[PDB]
Amino acid sequence: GASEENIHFSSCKEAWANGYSDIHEGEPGYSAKLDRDHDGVACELKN
């Protein structure tokens, strides 16, 4: 179970290198701490 555990990425560039894209609520990086525009998605890859 991939629960959130105080995860902190320096940038979405490092998140994408681990396959972390289209992050939803309750996943690591959904917060304003990752998504500069805080639009309720993180490291989005929807074309």
Which C-beta is closer to Ca ion: that of 7 or that of 21?
A: 21
Minimal distance, residue 3 CB to Ca ion, in Å: 23
With binding defined as CB under 5 A, does residue 25 bind Ca ion? no
Angle at 10 between CA 8 and CA 26, to 5 degrees: 35
Which C-beta is closer to Ca ion: that of 5 or that of 39?
A: 39
Pick from 46, 43, 47: nearest CA to 19: 43
Minimal distance, residue 34 CB to Ca ion, in Å: 9
